[PDB]
Amino acid sequence: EPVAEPDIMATNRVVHVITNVLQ
Amino acid sequence: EPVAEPDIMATNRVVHVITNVLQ
Amino acid sequence: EPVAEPDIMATNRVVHVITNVLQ
Amino acid sequence: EPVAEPDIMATNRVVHVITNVLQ
Amino acid sequence: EPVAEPDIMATNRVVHVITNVLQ
Amino acid sequence: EPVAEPDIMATNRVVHVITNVLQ
Amino acid sequence: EPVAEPDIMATNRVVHVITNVLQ
Amino acid sequence: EPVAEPDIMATNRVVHVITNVLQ
Amino acid sequence: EPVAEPDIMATNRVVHVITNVLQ
Amino acid sequence: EPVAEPDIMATNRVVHVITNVLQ
Amino acid sequence: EPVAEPDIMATNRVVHVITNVLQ
Amino acid sequence: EPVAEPDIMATNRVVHVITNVLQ
Amino acid sequence: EPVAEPDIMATNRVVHVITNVLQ
Amino acid sequence: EPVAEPDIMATNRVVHVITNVLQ
Amino acid sequence: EPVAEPDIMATNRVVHVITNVLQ
Amino acid sequence: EPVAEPDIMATNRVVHVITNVLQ
Amino acid sequence: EPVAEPDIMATNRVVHVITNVLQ
Amino acid sequence: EPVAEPDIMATNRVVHVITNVLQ
Amino acid sequence: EPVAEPDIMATNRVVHVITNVLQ
Amino acid sequence: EPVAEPDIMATNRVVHVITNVLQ
């Protein structure tokens, strides 16, 4: 909820999953 | 309320599912 | 409310799934 | 709902599904 | 969304599903 | 090299290999 | 080499290789 | 070199390979 | 080695490998 | 060469592999 | 400008039962 | 001007029961 | 002018039962 | 400008039962 | 703004049972 | 009695390479 | 007494590579 | 009495590589 | 009496590489 | 009585590489 003077920003959501099963 | 200095913005949602299953 | 400098933007949503098999 | 000068755009939604099987 | 002059545009949603056969 | 009176023994070797695939 | 009197023994070797396929 | 009085005995070797994958 | 009085005995070698994946 | 009275005995080698996935 | 590309559902279901007999 | 692209869907379900008998 | 991107989904459920008997 | 940003979700359930018997 | 921002969440459940009897 | 019963052998080798081109 | 029963053998080697280019 | 039973074996080796470029 | 029972063995080797770039 | 017990073993190797860059 940006409500102030103008500035620089960004919105980039990233998700990653990694796993190594040994059995 | 996404408002700020005129600039470039892109809602690029990156998703990836990786897993090294042995079976 | 995306209001800023008149620019071009396009969503680059990509999805990929990969696994392995061994029996 | 972005607005700008008459420009060109396109939804580059790509989807891929690949796995492996030994049978 | 684009609401400018009637320009050329069309969705290009590509899809591919293939599996490795072995039997 | 088992040697003795006649018996009704017999081998019952069976193999089972199941594998799932979701494509 | 199970040698003995002439009995009625016999081998019952059977193979079973089942695999699931989606296609 | 199994040599002795007669008796009942039969080999019942069985193998099972189970596996599951969630694509 | 088995060279004594008669006694019931038989091999029951069995293998079972279980594995799962949650992705 | 375990020689003695006819006592009950039978070899049975069992193996099991278990893993706890965490993602 | 209501536009939406088509879609197809690739529903699959596999099931079988096997019960031999020696007799 | 409602817009919403579709998504691929595929419900997988495997189940089987096997029971042997020597008689 | 509602907007809402979709999300890939897939229900996974596998189960099996086996009851071996030597008789 | 009502917009929804759902997250990725997928159900996972794997279980197996075995009850051997020599009879 | 009328925009939601849910948190990542996924159901996880892994359990198994094994039994054996010599009889 | 130097004799060995027959037995089927499972051996295969599959390979595939796909590459998209735009030009 | 050179005698040895056969056994099932499963040997495989799968490999695949996918690439993309926009030019 | 040169006798030696066989053993189950299944060698496998899977490998895959994926790359992407927008140019 | 040169006899020696074997043991279960299976060479496992899985590896993958990924290099994502937006350019 | 030349009988030497075996040695249980199981080769396991899991490794992966990832290099994400936005450029």
Author numbering:
A (entry chain P), B (entry chain L), C (entry chain H), D (entry chain D), E (entry chain T), F (entry chain C), ...: 1 to 23
From the article:
TGFBI-related corneal dystrophy (CD) is characterized by the accumulation of insoluble protein deposits in the corneal tissues, eventually leading to progressive corneal opacity. Mutations in the TGFBI gene results in the mutant protein product, TGFBI protein (TGFBIp) which is proteolytically cleaved in the corneal tissues. From our previous proteomics analysis and spatial high-resolution mass spectrometry imaging, we concluded that the TGFBIp is the main component of the amyloid aggregates found in patients’cornea and the TGFBIp-derived peptides are the predominant component of the TGFBIp fibril found in the amyloid deposits, respectively. Since the mechanism of amyloid disassembly by ATP-independent chaperones is unknown, we reconstructed atomic models of the amyloids self-assembled from TGFBIp-derived peptides and their complex with L-PGDS using cryo-EM and NMR.
Biophysical study of different mutants of the 611-633 region of the TGFBIp has revealed that the G623R mutant showed the highest amyloid aggregation propensity and fibril stability. Since this 611-633 region with the G623R mutation of the TGFBIp showed the most microscopically homogeneous fibrils and well-resolved ssNMR spectra, we have chosen it as our primary model system for structural studies. We used a hybrid structure determination approach combining ssNMR and cryo-EM to produce the atomic resolution model of the fibril. Next, we obtained an electron density map of the fibrils with 4.9 Å resolution after 3D refinement. Finally, we obtained the atomic model of the G623R fibrils through the combination of the data obtained from both techniques. From the analysis of the G623R fibril model, the R623 residue is involved in the formation of intermolecular salt-bridge with D617 and E615 in the opposite strand. Furthermore, when we simultaneously swapped the residues participating in this salt bridge in the double mutant (R623D, D617R), uniform fibrils could again be produced, thus validating the presence of this salt bridge in the amyloid model. Additionally, this thermodynamically favorable interaction provided by the inter-strand salt bridge likely accelerates the fibril growth of the G623R peptide compared to wild-type and other mutants. We identified the structurally frustrated interactions within the G623R fibril using the online server, Frustratometer40. From Fig. S13a, b the highly frustrated regions within the G623R fibrils, represented by red lines, are clustered around the β-turn region of the fibril. The β-turn region is enriched with negatively charged residues (E615 and D617) stacked upon each other which experiences strong charge-charge repulsion.
